[PDB]
Design a protein around this ligand. Structure first.
Ligand SMILES: CCCCCCCC/C=C/CCCCCCCC(=O)OC[C@H](COP(=O)(O)OCCN)OC(=O)CCCCCCC/C=C/CCCCCCCC
Ligand SMILES: CCCCCCCC/C=C/CCCCCCCC(=O)OC[C@H](COP(=O)(O)OCCN)OC(=O)CCCCCCC/C=C/CCCCCCCC
Lengths: 319, 309, 319, 316, 319, 319
């Protein structure tokens, strides 16, 4: 719909980063489901559960069947591959889903969603109202435009009485931003600390000697360096998702967003009776200013009693 | 648009149902994989170690694999995603059962339609300003419509009973799912001991098998258990909200204190339940509707129109 | 489209059941195409074309290549596997396609489709007519509204004269229901009879001794048990489908739907002269009663000749 | 494009049968691409380039590698498996694509498409014209509806002069029907004569003795039997298609569709002066009659000149 | 959209051929990706690096592992399979992409796209105007309809002045047709010359004797005969495509498409003042004549100034 | 949407080239995921970690299992295949994603997106204004048309004083073009430099003698050559992209786009009072001139005060 004006540049950037991280999750999950395996070769000479590592060259004969090799691979994939290298794509998918839910929670939570829909609808209809152009131009008026302007003025008064008492939208946005930086810190810590465990060479000691004949095996995890790449790329994107989110926190704490002053508008335009608004009205007008400040300007004429008197007088001239 | 009658619990349960459907689809796709179990026979016939020659073909190994998959692997570990699919289909079907009934949907649409007609009517804020030409005629017409709604929906109680039924069904399904899944989640094991009697076909009678995606199915089962637990806690809160206070009656006494009108009566039954629903959505709607419910306010409107004409 | 009013609850239920059955067919078809096989191992001890079943345990040496095993698997899958366990998903697909063709035949067959489209169009237009609202409330009539009411009233009369002659829609719906229930019976009979032939362990005596060295083999069909439960689930859906069809058949034998009495509406409404329609008019009115009686209530005030006289008088007043 | 009025029951039936033939073709093509292989085992005992087929049994040792087996499979699949069992899905693809092209050629070809759209537009406008309702009810007439009715009348006359001269639409539909029926005959002949060559057991004799050591092999074609059912069931569909097409041909040879008679409609209606139309307009009125009689009955009133005189004197 | 009037029968035919050609490209590319391989067996008996080709029969033993066979297949696929058999579908894909780009270049190129959109818009709006029907019938003329007709006349004159100055559309169309036909010639020549190299049996001599033990191998290319017939089928399509392009080229050279004559249209119609348009206007009028002469005949009356004078007189009587 | 007027031929060409490069990236990534492998055979004869390469022929016996071969392939793919040959499609996908982000950044960044939507809306409404047709023609005036013309004149003034102050859109487009040209330089550099490393035959020396028995192996990379015919092709596309971007670069440095000259437009038309717009207004008018100059003409009548005086006189006439 028309919620694009309610999403500043930081929200758009975080949404696109979430899309790329979802692409990472899907790609890694497809690879982990389809082609993730280990190629384990037994160590012929062992030195206290450690490989001893010791006329032409001829191949070492292990006497294992193909299914014994498959059993060794499965056991050393389950028991000795690190949990990060196995469940990295699913952790990424979980983190992306939580990030998306946090970013789009207030669009689905009924109390905030109703207020946001009301605000966006009245602001779109106000910005598209011809009375805004007529008033900012400062008697010719179309009749239907006449009671349209009057009804929209009354609707603006209704909305101010209906939204301004509460701050649920602002508090919800604050909590979403706080969660989206706490989770970013936790993700960065546990992902940077455990990314080094995605290795290509894995030495496994699984004690399946009664079924295979060997205790220690040397295994190759083929989709590891790629998992070292994707994770690194993921650690890049999350870092961006952190920094942007941190800026949002700064944007919500550098000044009080529960108070909006129309001082510039009544400084420029003639209608100096335009009051200052509080709470969710103030925060949503700040969000609108993050998209296009002109959307605020054409709204301000609808908040003034002098404009109400002028509209009433001109309508009364008309009908 | 029925979204105005979907509270936070309903939306949360719908999203949990979508997530559980995703889990079930992913589990089925994992079940699609051909290589499922890997079995090696038991007691097969610096130190240089040598491999044990089981003396079996690839077809013998595959035969052992399917025999132990059919007759040694637990049925839960093989059919958990399908059970998740069935359970989430039941949850999705029984979560919209209050909405998609024939007689209930018309009442819901009528209530939300005339409530939106209120929320957009000038006579509501005009009536608050009274308390604190064409629009008067539309006010009178909407007032007749409000009386029509009073005589049209207030009689029945199908909506509340139907919502209670679907909530109880959700709760009992959640209880059954949690109980049996928590009982059988211990059967999703990596190492399995298979003892099929195929000594005549292969030569061995005891096999040690590994279920390759047993770890993945265990994680999926725990995630589904968490999702169902959240779903059931949400449904238990829905039951608590349904039965901790009588939703068969709604008192307009808060408006009686706020609005100076005291003729405003206390409606009941489906009227009461849907007022509670829209109060969960937005409490301003009921307060603005109350000034249209009272009939002394209608007499005041009639007097105002009489003086205006 | 706009045929939702024409389809009753049983049609929607059968459509959903057909969708789930088609999902069964697709899933079983993919499993049959991709992973359906037999893993046949020869019986070393053969006594009269039967598996005789007679220090450390050691494996049996069959001295067969992988390709001889594949040949044995293909031959035994072709010959000694029952046709049901092989072509269950294709039979399900064919049955669902026939059920969907029967359920949606009248919407595609032009002779019935024209009548259904005409009835639905004028019924929806009469529902949306403002004269309907005036009649139920029983004035201010815009001339577009008045000409619409008069012209569509004449349209209703012409449609009644056009559609009262034939009863093709009722006959087609009856034939569709009868076919859908007799095919239900045949499906249940042949599916329930042959559902026990989907076995896991299958003995094959295919006489390929000159190519393999063995005559009897003991195959294991991996996609049998799954297929079995799929068949069971399919049977369940078919039973439900059948039950629904029987109710529809009962719904078309309880009362003559070619004679729709307007008794309840003509007693409730002031216009007590509403004539009793016959044939396809009556049948489509009964269907719209099953969907929503409010449609028939709003269409009833457009058939009565007292409503003709009152609309004519009030139109005369407005002219 | 609202062309559904130009598709009678035979056209809709053939479209659905062609869609199901598309599904046959895609399914068979996917199977022939992915899992159409051959499992060939050498015949150990050879008797003049043929298979002799002669306590505990022991498996036969062929001393062949897995790659020699794959080479034998490929060579006996290319050389000895009959080409029908290999290219039936591609043939059904080509045949049903030609069927769709024949069905939709008159819809995509600009010369016939323009005339089809022109006629459909004025038929739909006359079907919703208020004057048609008034005249079939047959003076009250608003100035604006009278103007639009006169404009539609002049459009009807000018388009009658524009279309009644030519007969390209009927000719194209005829040609499509004959091509469809003769292709039905050809498909049935060759498919029935070649459906018996899809066999599970095929004896291959390819002479790769220097590369394998054996000359004659016995091969199993796993996807043969399924194709057989597909082929047979595909054949059934074509039969229905042909029968349906046969009826269409019979219909277009039952009476001259290039002359449409309004005799019944102008007899039952008051206007007995309705002229008999010719050529393309006649054919498309016949198709519309095959769809619904009411459309033709209603358009009959816009062609008579007595209705024109009545409209003129009502407008006057 | 409504560019279909600018695509004559040859353009639609070439578009359909290009679509089926793209299906060929995708099908062959999928097959070459998934299953294109060689099954190579060494020639045990050789004479001067040539396959000599020389008690039941027993199999020939090569003493080669599966991996040695795979290496032999890879090397003989890389070095001795012809490049046409390997990269036929990619060449087809490239050729069809260039064909589609040449067919739809003028629709996306802004200079021609703006002119074509302007022409299509005012031609469709000229068609929609009832003044065309009234004039070709030759007062009955609505005031608003007359004013829209006057605005249409002014727009037609403005568009004629705007678009008759240059011939970018005609030049672009001619260049696209020439490029398409010369590419058809090159494709036919090289594909016909190289289609004989797609063979089932390929003798490879790759000198991997140090790694395998044999020099000459005989390889079977399974996806050869199909890659033959598709190519032949592709060739046939190109021929059809080429022939169509030939006719289009001839259609742009038989008569001067930059000098349009209204001779028949203005001879049959009463107005003899309709001037002969030139350049691009002539070109788009010929392309419209290919679709339907009715469009050009109704445009002729807005191109006539005597019809403009008649409209002026009728509107004069109306005011 | 209607943003096609803001995308000149260079932007459309780069979008299509990026689509083709994304297709290349997806195809190469699918091949890398599914079939990219090495087929490594050990060298029996070695000389200081180098392959020595020294009646009927018999196969060389390496005494290696299938799993030893798989391990050798994995190790030599990880350690001895060049990183370009393994991560070319992923680098291409990343480069296309960054290119498409740069091309579509100003359409998504709220500060520039709001102004672009504003300009597109006002220019499109000025294009379809009937007052423009009447004025370019140079009376009767529908009242709605008159007030819409006057209000759109005032809207032109308001949009002008809103946009002419800043040049954010021009700066963002400058930065996007600069990033897209330096990225093309980096891509062509490192891609031409490393394209020689995609070889079919790779001699790997990985020191796994304790697990395999051999020290040096001669691997074959089957997907090398196709990657080459991808990489070169990608290079070609990049070159085209770069050249196109270079033209765009020169297009914004050939003449000062920040000072639009209406000299030709005001010279042709009667209105010779057209003021020269500044900053983003000038830049967007130049972008419009690239698509279709006539739009600018049909916008000029809304910027001239002489046409404003004519409209005011006409409005005083009818009012
Ligand atoms: C022009 C280029 C642009 C288009 C390119 C698209 C690229 C598509 C990428 C596909 C990646 C997925 C491949 C997965 C399998 C890879 C390796 C593998 O297991 O396959 C080998 C093995 C080969 O064995 P057989 O075919 O028995 O060989 C003997 C020949 N009788 O293949 C398989 O069995 C697995 C096949 C999996 C892929 C299936 C995809 C085939 C899709 C068919 C397309 C046509 C469908 C409709 C056609 C209608 C009739 C024409
Ligand atoms: C986090 C939740 C995500 C959920 C998504 C689930 C996806 C489910 C996919 C179902 C897969 C079913 C097919 C299974 C085939 C198994 C074959 C196998 O084991 O692998 C063998 C072999 C791979 O091994 P090598 O050739 O050594 O290659 C690896 C080293 N280069 O593969 C095969 O032979 C065929 C594989 C079939 C592939 C099918 C899936 C491919 C999907 C493509 C990935 C994404 C598209 C391309 C991305 C490009 C970048 C945009």
């Amino acid at each position: 719909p028309a919620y694009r004006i309610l999403k500043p540049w930081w929200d758009v950037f975080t949404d696109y980063i979430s899309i790329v991280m979802l692409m990472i999750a899907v790609f890694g999950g497809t690879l982990q489901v389809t082609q993730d395996k280990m190629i384990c070769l037994p160590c012929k000479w062992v030195t206290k559960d450690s490989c001893n590592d010791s006329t032409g060259p001829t191949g070492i004969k292990y006497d294992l069947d193909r299914h014994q090799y498959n059993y060794v691979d499965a056991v050393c994939y389950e028991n000795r591959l690190h949990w990060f290298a196995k469940y990295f794509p699913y952790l990424v998918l979980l983190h992306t889903l939580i990030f998306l839910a946090c970013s789009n929670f207030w669009f689905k939570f009924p109390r905030t969603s109703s207020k946001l829909e009301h605000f966006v609808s009245i602001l779109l209809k106000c910005f598209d109202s011809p009375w805004t152009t007529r008033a900012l131009s400062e008697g010719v008026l179309d009749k239907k435009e006449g009671e349209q302007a009057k009804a929209l003025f009354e609707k603006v008064k209704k909305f101010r009485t209906h939204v301004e008492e509460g701050d649920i939208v602002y508090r919800l946005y604050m909590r979403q931003t706080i969660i989206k930086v706490i989770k970013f810190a936790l993700i960065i810590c546990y992902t940077v600390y455990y990314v080094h465990n995605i290795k290509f060479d894995v030495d496994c000691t699984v004690d399946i000697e009664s079924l295979t004949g060997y205790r220690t095996y040397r295994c190759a995890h083929p989709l590891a360096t790629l998992f070292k790449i994707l994770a690194s790329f993921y650690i890049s994107l999350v870092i961006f998702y952190g920094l942007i989110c941190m800026y949002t926190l700064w944007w919500m704490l550098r000044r009080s967003l529960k108070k909006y002053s129309f001082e510039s508008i009544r400084e420029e335009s003639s209608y100096s009776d335009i009051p200052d608004v509080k709470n969710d009205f103030a925060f949503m007008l700040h969000l609108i200013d993050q998209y296009d400040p002109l959307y605020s300007k054409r709204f301000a004429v609808f908040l003034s009693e002098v404009s109400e008197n002028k509209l009433r007088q001109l309508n009364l001239n008309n009908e | 648009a029925f979204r105005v009658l979907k509270p936070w619990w309903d939306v949360f349960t719908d999203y949990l149902s979508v997530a559980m459907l995703m889990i079930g689809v992913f589990g089925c796709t994992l079940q699609v994989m051909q290589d499922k179990i890997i079995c090696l026979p038991k007691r097969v016939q610096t130190v240089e170690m040598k491999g044990l020659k089981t003396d079996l073909d690839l077809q013998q190994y595959s035969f052992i694999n399917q025999m132990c998959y059919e007759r040694a692997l637990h049925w839960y570990a093989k059919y958990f995603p399908y059970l998740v699919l069935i359970h989430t289909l039941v949850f999705m079907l029984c979560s919209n059962f209050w909405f998609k009934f024939p007689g209930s949907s018309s009442k819901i649409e009528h209530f939300i339609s005339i409530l939106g007609k209120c929320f957009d009517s000038p006579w509501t804020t005009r009536a608050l300003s009274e308390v604190s030409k064409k629009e008067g005629e539309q006010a009178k017409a909407l007032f007749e419509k409000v009386k029509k709604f009073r005589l049209h929906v207030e009689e029945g109680d199908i909506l509340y009973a139907m919502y209670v039924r679907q909530t109880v069904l959700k709760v009992i399904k959640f209880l059954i799912i949690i109980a049996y899944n928590s009982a059988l989640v211990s059967k999703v094991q990596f190492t399995v001991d298979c003892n099929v009697d195929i000594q005549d076909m292969t030569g061995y009678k005891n096999f040690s098998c590994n279920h390759t995606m047993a770890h993945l199915f265990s994680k999926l089962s725990f995630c589904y258990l968490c999702f169902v637990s959240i779903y059931g806690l949400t449904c238990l809160y829905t039951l608590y909200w349904l039965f901790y206070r009588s939703l068969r009656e709604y008192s307009f006494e808060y408006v009686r204190q706020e609005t100076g009108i005291d003729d405003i009566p206390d409606v009941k039954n489906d009227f009461a339940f849907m007022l509670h629903m829209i109060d969960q959505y937005d409490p301003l709607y009921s307060k603005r509707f109350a000034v249209f419910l009272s009939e002394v306010s209608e007499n005041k409107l009639k007097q105002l129109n009489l003086n205006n004409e």
